[PDB]
């Protein structure tokens, strides 16, 4: 019935299995990324934060592909691990061959070609994982890309994948400055959009992970912000929201007087 | 059936295997061919069909190594494949051993090759029945091979569509064989094809092929005007 195999065309020309993978990406934890002329950054939510879980790994969704690139994964865990290892292998193969870091677009293209082969060939289900890549290369500087289960990728100034991606991307569209966004404003916007998209009480700092890539002294640095910094950002956002609510209450009181 | 005849790998719940029977049916979609043998000759005679009055008549007698010829009834693709295999086997035998391959051994090779498909799901049984005429130092041989991978050493046989008329004629007249001149032998074969022919039809030089092998006679195929000395001599009904 046109979805029993990944290599079957619907009579309208649609690969229902690829569409199923694309939709299924919606189960993954909300990851998002913002590009700033000072740097680039990702944020991501921890879907499961049980108190009995340990925190052995410094990051669950954000991986460091090489010196100048990181990526957030959203989708099936096994597929995400496979693709992260393959991304690292691709980057290091390019570095071995050419003696310079793989450009971000080339790395994205390589992994997306792997994904396309999986969608096209034989009895292999498509990779049910979407990816958000951030990086810096000598050609286009800071870059942010997004890649689908179907092996299609695009370059974005700001984007979001996973849960409530529609709301997050609409919010970024509303409140992103196309060419006048710095890293501090990017972090503030990331906290705002995560708070409005997670839809779980207050923005618990332990339920979010943020990473920032920036050039410094001629070398790229990828830092996963410590929980102290994340808590400080959340507290500043909460103070801003409280100030806005106080202003609105004062306006309501003035209207009552009028 | 309906779930026990999809492939050769499934036995039906009766000890019966269905795709082999379907191939044995495919053998009947060919054309009539009668093989027979005296004590010093072997003759295959085939009723060549015609796809149109312009198109020539499809050949039905093929020439395996000099002492062997073949008459085919069934899928022409499988006929070609088996003819190529038989030619290769005869050539290999004549290369290793400087003597012609015995017909009774060539047929065993054909049987093994055709049995292999009838047990594994990778292909279909060879839907072609063969009448193998040969002359080895033992004597003239006529063999029949069926898609089931079974071969019978026949003193005279017939295969193809409308075969029982020729088979009954052969059963009736086989006592005459052995002590027959080559002309009489070919005449008996032609009579068998006449019997299998529809009444209004008749054997013409256009639609009759006659392969003969025997002592001091390497397998020769007579077609078109080559059969005139046989049909002309043949008595009329």
């Amino acid at each position: 019935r046109y979805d029993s195999r990944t290599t079957i065309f619907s009579p309208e020309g649609r690969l229902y299995q690829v569409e199923y993978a694309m939709e299924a990406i919606g189960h993954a934890g909300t990851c998002l990324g913002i590009l700033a002329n000072d740097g680039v950054l990702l944020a991501a939510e921890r879907r499961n934060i049980h108190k009995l879980l340990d925190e052995v790994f410094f990051s669950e969704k954000i991986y460091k592909l090489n010196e100048d690139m990181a990526c957030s994964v959203a989708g099936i865990t096994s597929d995400a691990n496979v693709l992260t290892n393959e991304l690292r292998l691709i980057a290091q193969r390019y570095l071995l061959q050419y003696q310079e870091p793989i450009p971000c677009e080339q790395l994205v293209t390589a992994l997306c070609d792997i994904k396309q082969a999986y969608t096209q060939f034989g009895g292999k289900r498509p990779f049910g994982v979407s990816l958000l890549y951030i990086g810096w290369d000598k050609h286009y500087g800071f870059q942010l890309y997004q890649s689908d289960p179907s092996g299609n990728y695009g370059g974005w100034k700001a984007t979001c994948i996973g849960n409530n991606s529609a709301a997050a991307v609409s919010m970024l569209k509303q409140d992103y400055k196309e060419g006048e966004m710095t890293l501090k404003s990017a972090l503030a916007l990331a906290i705002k959009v995560l708070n409005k998209t997670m839809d779980v009480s207050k923005l618990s700092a332990e339920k979010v992970e943020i990473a920032t890539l920036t050039r410094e002294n001629g070398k790229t640095v990828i830092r996963v912000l410590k929980q102290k910094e994340v808590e400080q950002l959340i507290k500043k956002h909460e103070e801003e929201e409280a100030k806005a609510e106080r202003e609105k209450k004062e306006k309501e009181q003035k209207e009552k007087d009028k | 059936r309906n779930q026990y005849d999809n492939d050769v790998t499934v036995w039906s719940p009766q000890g019966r295997i269905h795709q082999i029977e379907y191939a044995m049916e495919a053998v009947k979609q060919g054309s009539a061919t009668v093989g027979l043998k005296s004590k010093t000759h072997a003759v295959l005679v085939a009723l060549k069909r015609a796809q149109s009055e312009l198109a020539a008549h499809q050949k039905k007698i093929l020439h395996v190594d000099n002492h062997i010829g073949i008459s085919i009834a069934g899928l022409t693709a499988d006929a070609r494949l088996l003819c190529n295999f038989m030619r290769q086997e005869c050539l290999d035998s004549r290369f290793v051993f400087d003597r012609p391959l015995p017909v009774s051994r060539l047929v065993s090779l054909i049987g093994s090759k055709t049995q292999i498909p009838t047990q594994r799901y990778g292909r279909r049984p060879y839907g072609v029945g063969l009448l193998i005429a040969g002359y080895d130092d033992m004597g003239p041989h006529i063999f029949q091979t069926c898609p089931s991978a079974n071969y019978f050493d026949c003193r005279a046989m017939s295969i193809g569509a409308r075969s029982q008329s020729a088979r009954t004629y052969l059963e009736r007249h086989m006592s005459e064989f052995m002590e027959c001149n080559l002309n009489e032998l070919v005449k008996h074969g032609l009579r068998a094809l006449r019997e299998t022919l529809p009444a209004e039809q008749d054997l013409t030089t256009k639609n009759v092929s006659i392969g003969i092998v025997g002592k001091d006679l390497e397998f020769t195929i007579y077609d078109d005007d080559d059969v005139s000395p046989f049909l002309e001599g043949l008595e009329e009904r």
Binding site: R47, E60, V73, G75, T77, A80, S201 | -
Partner: protein, 152 residues
């Protein structure tokens, strides 16, 4: 009345016929004169496009769960006939109930009243409403961490 299935051994052809008759009655020959229809459904994505077609269903009203202000309103509505103690904050209860439907709010009021009934009381307090909220909005989240962690 729901998405039509291909007529076969696994299709409710008779219910499909009933729905077709209803469609014809809503909009066919001899349009209705003064009959207005209020259909109600809990999942709209499955209704037949023929039913959802305008002219048959001219308007479609969504009923989102209350947005904490509708929740305060529902709390007031269902606590009007109740002996609420002073210092009781239905606004706080509304905040404590995120994404809760009007049925959930009515059940909250009912269960707080039941807590009051238990202790031979005719009295409801903030603790009673909070315990009722906890008891009514009880979620059966996933049990197994493996099935929970299949997806990143």
């Amino acid at each position: 009345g729901s998405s039509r299935l291909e007529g076969g051994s696994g299709g409710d052809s008779e219910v499909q016929r009933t729905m077709l008759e209803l469609l014809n009655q809503l909009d066919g020959f001899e349009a209705t004169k003064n009959i207005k229809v209020i259909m109600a459904t809990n999942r709209i994505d499955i209704l037949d496009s023929a039913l959802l077609r305008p002219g048959r269903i001219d308007r479609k009203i969504e009923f989102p769960p209350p947005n904490e202000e509708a929740r305060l309103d529902i709390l007031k509505i269902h606590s009007r006939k109740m002996n609420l103690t002073r210092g009781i904050n239905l606004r706080k209860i509304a905040e404590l109930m995120p994404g809760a439907s009007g049925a959930e709010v009515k059940g909250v009021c009912t269960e707080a009243g039941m807590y009051a009934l238990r202790e031979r009381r005719v009295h409801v307090t903030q603790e009673d409403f909070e315990m009722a909220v906890a008891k009514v909005m009880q979620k059966d989240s996933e049990k197994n961490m493996s099935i929970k962690k299949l997806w990143k």
